[PDB]
Amino acid sequence: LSTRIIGGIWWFFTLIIISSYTANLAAFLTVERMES
């Protein structure tokens, strides 16, 4: 319906947000643990 697409857009959008900063913080810690 017309409300199902709006819910999917907003859930997808906040999913994109949390996936983005999860990957960003995780790879930040990855490049951080590189230590010599």
Binding site: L1, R4, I5, G8
Partner: peptide, 15 residues
């Protein structure tokens, strides 16, 4: 395509 597949199923299903 996979997301709107359920949408057109519900369009053809509901009607």
């Amino acid at each position: 395509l996979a997301y709107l597949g359920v949408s057109v199923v519900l369009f053809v299903i509901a009607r």
